[PDB]
Ligand binder design. Sequence first.
Ligand SMILES: *Cc1c(COP(=O)(O)O)cnc(C)c1O
Ligand SMILES: *Cc1c(COP(=O)(O)O)cnc(C)c1O
Lengths: 465, 465
Amino acid sequence: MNASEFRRRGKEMVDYVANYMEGIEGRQVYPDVEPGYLRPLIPAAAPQEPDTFEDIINDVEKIIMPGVTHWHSPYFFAYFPTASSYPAMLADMLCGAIGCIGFSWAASPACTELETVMMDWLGKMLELPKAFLNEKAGEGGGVIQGSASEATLVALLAARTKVIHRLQAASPELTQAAIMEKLVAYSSDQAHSSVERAGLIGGVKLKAIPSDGNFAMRASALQEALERDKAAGLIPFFMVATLGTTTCCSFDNLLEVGPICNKEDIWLHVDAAYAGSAFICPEFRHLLNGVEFADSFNFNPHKWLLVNFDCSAMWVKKRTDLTGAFLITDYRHWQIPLGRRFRSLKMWFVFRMYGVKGLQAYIRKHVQLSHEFESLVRQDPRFEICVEVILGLVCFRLKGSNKVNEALLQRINSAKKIHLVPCHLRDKFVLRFAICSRTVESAHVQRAWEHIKELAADVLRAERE
Amino acid sequence: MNASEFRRRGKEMVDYVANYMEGIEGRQVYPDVEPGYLRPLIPAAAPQEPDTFEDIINDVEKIIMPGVTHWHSPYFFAYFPTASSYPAMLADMLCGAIGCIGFSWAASPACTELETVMMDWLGKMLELPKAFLNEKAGEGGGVIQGSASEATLVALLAARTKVIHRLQAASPELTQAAIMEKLVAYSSDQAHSSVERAGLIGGVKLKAIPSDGNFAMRASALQEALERDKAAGLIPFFMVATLGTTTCCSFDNLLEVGPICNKEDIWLHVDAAYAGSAFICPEFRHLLNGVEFADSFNFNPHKWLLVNFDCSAMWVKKRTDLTGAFLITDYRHWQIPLGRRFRSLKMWFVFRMYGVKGLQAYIRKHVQLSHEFESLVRQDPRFEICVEVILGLVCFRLKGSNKVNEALLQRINSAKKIHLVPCHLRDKFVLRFAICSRTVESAHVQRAWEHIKELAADVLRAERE
Ligand SMILES: *Cc1c(COP(=O)(O)O)cnc(C)c1O
Ligand SMILES: *Cc1c(COP(=O)(O)O)cnc(C)c1O
């Protein structure tokens, strides 16, 4: 394929993408296929001679789309939003066209320099402490990571290297392994599974801090764990505090946990993968208070800031600590892989084509829609809200047994009109309602609640009986 | 931005991308900017109100392009090729449009099922042993990784988990840490830096095996290292054998190293990140002989098989060993991150729009151009070829001191007409000539050699004098 043919097919793909987005409300949000549906529908071997673009696009509609879960359907209310905007799509096309692998400054200077400036743009939009920004010769700085899960692993590896060096400085005869079986990392009992995966990769123990009634990490529970583990010979070295937990969008108390981590010499990493995008709005910035005590901070523009995956933004106070784990000219020692693509183009395009006010309006509309769903639930005494509604998530359930709530969820996902997922809060089975699609409106939320209300009546009938 | 506006701007971006590719030979391949050039040229903060698409695209030409190293210029001869094809670009546009995060089967069934079938397509194109393919209920299988560096880390973590479990089964009182300071991994002295990074992340020792006269790992050097380290109390557990080393495109001997790794219970990972694409051609498949002894095999379609980054293909013999490190319905335990995008669409589009024969012709043209450059060097007795030319890489130098070769390289990269990078073979400073661009032709290679020949005369003058 040459560029002349790409001129034709590329514009045809633009129309196909726009057609799919304009009719996405006509798609069943969750598929009806079963595992293994795809292999019988395509050949067992690659074609020796080429297929036509018409044949391929037909297969996308006939064979791929039936097995697609439409994350950007307005009726997708599962997990958390993922980003989809046309400015990011346009930058992605340019990113693949330039096609550089910026493992070094020389590999493409703009690939590294634009990223550093965009991380300062974003840091200033969130009003981060100046110690996190790279501008003005500061020792801190920011990098794009592939994911928040990778960002958490990177912070743990930097913390592990730092504590090993400190411990061996105090005791030069101490081996890295003898240190290894004493290190312990901490996170909330509401922490994302990325923390457990990072502890396993890094080869250190991980313990969960019990959350309070609001599912937040507090000073008293942390001090109680430190007292026990330090007496047992464990060495606390790393902490993941979460702002906007995956379970119920709760918030660990940084003003309490921060000073404790500092005095204990515990590397404090803040996981705000979903909630972080809201901190560009002044009415939510107070939820970030205490980040000045953190050693690293991370959130996902590819969740709630319209920058298509992959784009996770991570800042650190000391870049030298980051480079220990394997003005800013190179990002090799900031990430797990060595290669990387021109991902900052997506941030640049999104920030410029929306503006700060356009992004703020997008956040506030989603939070407003969240409170609209919460208001509907609060009008039905058969239901209860389990956690305070702050951002684009509502955790609710039928009053009574978990069995009746497991049955309501099964009916919802069986009808395949809307899609949501549950969680477990202590021993309580809880349903989640997450505002996800960029194009979701009040009408979609209202229809979703009517569907939930109807199915709950059928479920409540079947259990009394 | 709505879909109607994307219809206009998306087609405008298609024309901009096609224009850039059609005029890429008019671009200076390596930039003249210095580190820090970008920040003074764009504002210090994001715009509050949106900018226009016209303003942004103008900034791409005025401000971004001067700091771009054009990897797809025909005169880019550095490192190794990276993939850029229009079928992959078209699939990338669709990938971002579907916009699913396939961390689970339910997150989008097609995102996982197409990947498994495409890895069987690719495995059959390389004529891998059936134990690596997923088709027909085999215990093996393949996954797309973000990079070969990440693929090497994943194999090391699986090997580490497996040997820890085996050692603790034989000695139940043995701690994971006591095992940790005895584990040792191996690689060639020509190994990519990804291996050293994986050893540091995994927390294990890494030793280099001395290469032979052809810079290949051999049985005798491996047996000598095993004899020394086993006597010292180290426990060999992981080996990275390289097919197509980054330094000189040498090949470790799998027929010798494979059986040794098997009998020593050493997990054998084969790193063929660049060379692997050539193994779809029958005349090169013999270079892969011995992969039947490997526990995991990896190569990069995003290097030499026209599938735009990111796309690294990894196969394993036992998926259960892979899932230990944190029919095929989930890929969470095959990779470092949890989230992932619909990357298999790029493989599907490239394989179908080119066909196996189209990809074979692309490989053979590059190798033919490599031998054309080698032939020119072999006509000049002032130069020498240091390693046998097999694929798209030629390692050459002026006969004499390293200083005269360091000077020739500095003149080449200072003239900014072509771009290449050097290596070190033992104590010898060596220049690399890599066939990279998809659109490179004989005329480009011939002009590059004339440039090198001219600058070598100037350099040889300045040193005798
Ligand atoms: C989504 C989420 C993650 C996962 O991040 P990815 O970028 O998908 O790896 C981690 N932590 C929290 C709190 C999240 O919401
Ligand atoms: C390029 C290369 C790598 C690097 O792989 P990435 O996908 O860039 O991480 C590793 N090993 C070899 C042999 C390579 O050629």
